[PDB]
Amino acid sequence: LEVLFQGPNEFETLELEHLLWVNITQVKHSIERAWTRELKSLNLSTEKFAILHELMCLGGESTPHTLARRIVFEPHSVSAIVSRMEKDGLIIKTKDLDKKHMVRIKLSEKAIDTFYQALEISNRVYKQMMASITREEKVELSKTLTKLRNHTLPLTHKHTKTLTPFKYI
Amino acid sequence: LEVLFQGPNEFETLELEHLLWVNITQVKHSIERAWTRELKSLNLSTEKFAILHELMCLGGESTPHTLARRIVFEPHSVSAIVSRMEKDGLIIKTKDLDKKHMVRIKLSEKAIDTFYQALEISNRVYKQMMASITREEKVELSKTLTKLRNHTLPLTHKHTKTLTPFKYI
Ligand SMILES: Oc1cccc(Cl)c1Cl
Numbered sequence: 001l002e003v004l005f006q007g008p009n010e011f012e013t014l015e016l017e018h019l020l021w022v023n024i025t026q027v028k029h030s031i032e033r034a035w036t037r038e039l040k041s042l043n044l045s046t047e048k049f050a051i052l053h054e055l056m057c058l059g060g061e062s063t064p065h066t067l068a069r070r071i072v073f074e075p076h077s078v079s080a081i082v083s084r085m086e087k088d089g090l091i092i093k094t095k096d097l098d099k100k101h102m103v104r105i106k107l108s109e110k111a112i113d114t115f116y117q118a119l120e121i122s123n124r125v126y127k128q129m130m131a132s133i134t135r136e137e138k139v140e141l142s143k144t145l146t147k148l149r150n151h152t153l154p155l156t157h158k159h160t161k162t163l164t165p166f167k168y169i
Numbered sequence: 170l171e172v173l174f175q176g177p178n179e180f181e182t183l184e185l186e187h188l189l190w191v192n193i194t195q196v197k198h199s200i201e202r203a204w205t206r207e208l209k210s211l212n213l214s215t216e217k218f219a220i221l222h223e224l225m226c227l228g229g230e231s232t233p234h235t236l237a238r239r240i241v242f243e244p245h246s247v248s249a250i251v252s253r254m255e256k257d258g259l260i261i262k263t264k265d266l267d268k269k270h271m272v273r274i275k276l277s278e279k280a281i282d283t284f285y286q287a288l289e290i291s292n293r294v295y296k297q298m299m300a301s302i303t304r305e306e307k308v309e310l311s312k313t314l315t316k317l318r319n320h321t322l323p324l325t326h327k328h329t330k331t332l333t334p335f336k337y338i
């Protein structure tokens with residue numbers, strides 16, 4: 001009954017470390033896709049929401065260099081996203097007085113109101129997405145991911161990042 | 170000595186489910202950045218390598234729709250990447266005989282040789298990246314990520330994916 005010579009080939013067995021990269025990539029994609037659709041009426045991408053969040057931790061105002069240091073993304077990516085947010089009335093850029101060529105970036109009241117709304121929806125989205133894993137699995141998942149982050153980030157970010165020390169209770 | 174009113178505000182404490190999304194995003198970014206630089210002399214992005222890998226599991230030849238079903242990414246993304254790979258001599262597209270408007274996609278010998286090389290480097294890269302977590306932590310990390318994937322993928326992919334059943338030993 002079973003056809004011959006059709007079954008998976010050797011490229012379907014991976015080193016476990018390679019399978020973990022596949023698993024990270026797939027989870028990142030499936031969560032982002034579902035979250036992005038729930039948040040469509042606020043017009044946010046995951047990176048725009050990240051930048052709103054980071055600026056909120058910085059009190060709503062900062063400079064491109066301080067923001068870039070606090071967040072994982074590349075500075076050129078961050079500057080492109082910030083310009084798009086500026087176009088959309090989310091970010092106000094002002095020439096620092098006297099400090100020539102230095103820019104200040106500030107969330108508008110619209111951005112802050114959007115962040116309010118998007119944070120409350122996002123909490124609900126991530127909680128329903130992760131309801132199938134236990135509190136203990138969640139704690140361990142953050143510990144292992146944090147180890148991976150701490151061992152890999154310095155391979156290409158040499159003192160250029162001081163990532164926001166997020167906590168949970 | 171310690172300055173007042175300067176310390177993190179309430180946006181630096183997250184729900185654990187939100188912190189896990191931050192942790193997934195950060196690990197995905199730090200691993201991709203370091204891997205992409207090691208693989209620069211083959212000119213591969215993580216998605217191009219993924220598409221080479223998936224086509225290798227399919228025996229080097231397939232159609233855009235079968236490839237799209239096997240892989241996590243959106244079909245329009247996959248088609249853009251495939252066209253870029255075609256430009257680079259990695260993919261050959263041929264009009265199916267008689268089956269009008271149907272396309273076959275096939276890895277060139279150059280692509281297959283590149284995949285060979287990139288797979289061997291990638292195994293070494295992911296292993297050195299993950300040497301700080303144990304075999305048991307790695308096994309559990311894949312199990313938890315797999316649960317997250319299985320609960321979230323169907324929120325936006327309704328029977329449209331039959332993901333490649335990758336194994337490890
Ligand atoms: O830096 C962040 C803040 C909130 C969400 C996310 Cl994904 C990130 Cl990377």
Ligand SMILES: Oc1cccc(Cl)c1Cl
Pocket residue numbers: 021022025026215218219220222223240241
């Ligand atoms: O589908 C895949 C095959 C190899 C590597 C990766 Cl990241 C993916 Cl998503």
